[PDB]
Amino acid sequence: TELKGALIGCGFFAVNQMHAWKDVKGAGIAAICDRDPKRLKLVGDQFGIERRYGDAAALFADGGFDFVDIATTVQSHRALVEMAAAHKVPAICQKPFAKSLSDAKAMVRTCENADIPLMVHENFRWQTPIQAVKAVLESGAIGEPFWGRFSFRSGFDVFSGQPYLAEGERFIIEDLGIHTLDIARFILGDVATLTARTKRVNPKIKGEDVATILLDHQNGATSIVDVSYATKLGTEPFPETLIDIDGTQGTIRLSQGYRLEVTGPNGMTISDASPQLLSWASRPWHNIQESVLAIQQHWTDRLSSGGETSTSGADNLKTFALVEAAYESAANGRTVDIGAML
Amino acid sequence: TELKGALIGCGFFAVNQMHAWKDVKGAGIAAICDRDPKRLKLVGDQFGIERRYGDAAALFADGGFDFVDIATTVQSHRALVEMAAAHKVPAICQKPFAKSLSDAKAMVRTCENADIPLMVHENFRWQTPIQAVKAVLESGAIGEPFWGRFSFRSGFDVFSGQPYLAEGERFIIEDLGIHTLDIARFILGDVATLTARTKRVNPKIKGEDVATILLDHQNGATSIVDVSYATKLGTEPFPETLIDIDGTQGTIRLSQGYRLEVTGPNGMTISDASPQLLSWASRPWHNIQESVLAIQQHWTDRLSSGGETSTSGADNLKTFALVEAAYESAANGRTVDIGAML
Ligand SMILES: NC(=O)c1ccc[n+]([C@@H]2O[C@H](COP(=O)([O-])OP(=O)(O)OC[C@H]3O[C@@H](n4cnc5c(N)ncnc54)[C@H](O)[C@@H]3O)[C@@H](O)[C@H]2O)c1
Ligand SMILES: NC(=O)c1ccc[n+]([C@@H]2O[C@H](COP(=O)([O-])OP(=O)(O)OC[C@H]3O[C@@H](n4cnc5c(N)ncnc54)[C@H](O)[C@@H]3O)[C@@H](O)[C@H]2O)c1
Ligand SMILES: [Mg+2]
Ligand SMILES: [Mg+2]
């Protein structure tokens, strides 16, 4: 049962997804789609794809694939997911999931009514270091977690790879903070209330590139999500997410260079949580690139057995509501009940 | 020529102040005062102070000192500052300044009508590393500051040397966070608005021992004041305050071991901001103990020069409001307007 997938949106990051599909056991890419025949041709030759489509409606009409991997930008997401549901094709969707929390819910509802899986490609929680933090806290090595911090502070030029980032009136939460919020959820549970502040420091972008978010977790823990693309440090940590967790029995400290300090009753342990460097990977992206293979293999496995995925459309609504809360909060000075939004 | 001071409250921390007055150029301690006959004996004998009093009223009646140094616990701060003003004797008063913001304002007003200097003994500000960070930022090394973190996370047994801390129904913001909020003002200026979460983790005490505070500075900067005494680290940082600052041209990062790191236009510097170990000083408190010499020497200088001190009673109202806002916000769950309190 070698699953045959189709990829819609042969863009900058989709090249990572295509490399990873070769490595994925039990699945591979049978067709591709793109409105930009330059990208369709370039990706098509690179990964040796016979079937190529100028529009996604033709692709879905011909079929011959078990699942669809949507790697377009947010504009196309809702329709391509709706197309996928009408044709009963299981769907993976990049982030941001949708333009609003409304769009995301209808996208979750359409796929449930159709009885098809819907994973959101949210690969930050699928990195080795992040999993190691979860693994540690899951064991009980530091007792009940009560306080956390999640940090992604960088001066790396993401705007060359992704020019659209500088164009929007929204930027860092929508794009990057969405991940860091997903990790806060993934480590400390769902969020009851959220308060946020944003700022634009960089004068060559239309959007906020610094954000600081304070999270009240349902489980009792407080956490800090702080992100910036205007932080100029001695060593560029990009694209690492630094994490501190305190609990009743101990502390976790995931720091720059993937050094992982855990301290408990028995004592301290220092562990190297560095990612693997895959054959097609490229520094410093190798961290994220590995997590593409992790989440795509996870999709394939959960699909082949029947189960729900980790970042299912259903799950991802609870991450996406923090993003939407954050912007709301940023324009009011005021806390947002997350429970009321869902 | 040397100024004559009188010390009211010969407890635990007053012993550091006494040593420092010895070292301070231009001042000494002519008289000590304490309500406990055994403390009055111990400190009096250790520092060879002839004049000893069981009550401040008798002390103030006899007079013969140019300033008073109040190092009692918070309950008797108002009465002693009010006596000081009634006898026109310049006053140094410990933290916490008063029991409420109401009391503090009234104490500041009393000292202005009597027309005497009033300085809150708020010494964290005067630590070598904390001054070093101030100097970097003033230099303009990193441009305009836009974001800060001020962190004091320890598992140290402070309860032995000060039993009242466990007893208080309010703990960490009143005791330690007052320092970290003062530092946030010192580095990034006054606060427009404030929002705070707290919890008690230690089963043994009655007060909150973890606080996470998010500050909106008038100059546009945002910061996180996070403090804890229920934090179990593999190397105990007590009593260091770890500071992170981001500005438009660079960053400051003061990490454990008084390691100051500045990144700017002209590369990146690393310096050692650790304090002197004074003859009478003793690790790991040499941090705080040096600042006592600094602030008291600063007071003498300023009382001689007729200049208003750095932690003047009136300035310290803008710190104290943040403590009173943080408790209020922790209960509310709602952002507090600072300017309205003042
Ligand atoms: N960590 C991650 O998982 C990660 C990393 C980078 C980017 N992303 C996300 O991936 C998405 C794409 O990022 P990118 O930088 O590759 O953008 P991109 O512009 O390079 O890629 C989008 C491609 O999709 C095509 N496209 C758009 N609408 C289409 C439609 N209706 N049918 C067919 N093709 C269509 C465009 O021609 C373009 O080539 C973004 O939403 C971004 O948030 C995720
Ligand atoms: N870094 C610092 O600046 C620092 C460090 C520790 C404590 N403190 C502050 O110092 C203050 C005292 O701390 P401590 O640990 O020395 O407490 P303590 O109980 O050891 O000392 C206070 C002393 O004052 C005496 N006293 C109280 N009321 C009096 C009155 N009306 N007249 C005469 N004597 C009186 C008591 O008998 C006691 O001996 C606290 O308010 C605390 O916030 C500051
Ligand atoms: Mg394959
Ligand atoms: Mg002297």
Question: How do you describe this structure in short?
Answer:
Chains A, B: This is D-apiose dehydrogenase. Two copies of one chain form a homodimer. The first copy, chain A, contains ten helices and 15 strands.
SSE arrangement:
Two copies of one chain form a homodimer.
Chain A: E1 3-8, H1 14-23, E2 27-33, H2 37-46, E3 51-53, H3 56-62, E4 67-70, H4 74-86, E5 91-93, H5 101-113, E6 118-120, H6 128-139, E7 145-153, H7 172-188, E8 191-199, E9 210-217, E10 222-228, E11 242-247, E12 250-255, E13 259-263, E14 268-272, H8 286-305, H9 313-332, E15 336-337, H10 338-341
Parallel strand pairs in A: 1-2, 1-4, 2-3, 4-5, 5-6, 7-10
Antiparallel strand pairs in A: 7-11, 8-9, 8-15, 9-10, 11-12, 12-13, 13-14
The structure holds nicotinamide-adenine-dinucleotide (2 copies) and magnesium ion (2 copies).
The site of one magnesium ion has 5 residues of chain B, from helix 1 and strand 2.
Protein name (chains A, B): D-apiose dehydrogenase
Function (chains A, B): Involved in catabolism of D-apiose. Catalyzes oxidation of D-apiose to D-apionolactone.
EC number (chains A, B): 1.1.1.420
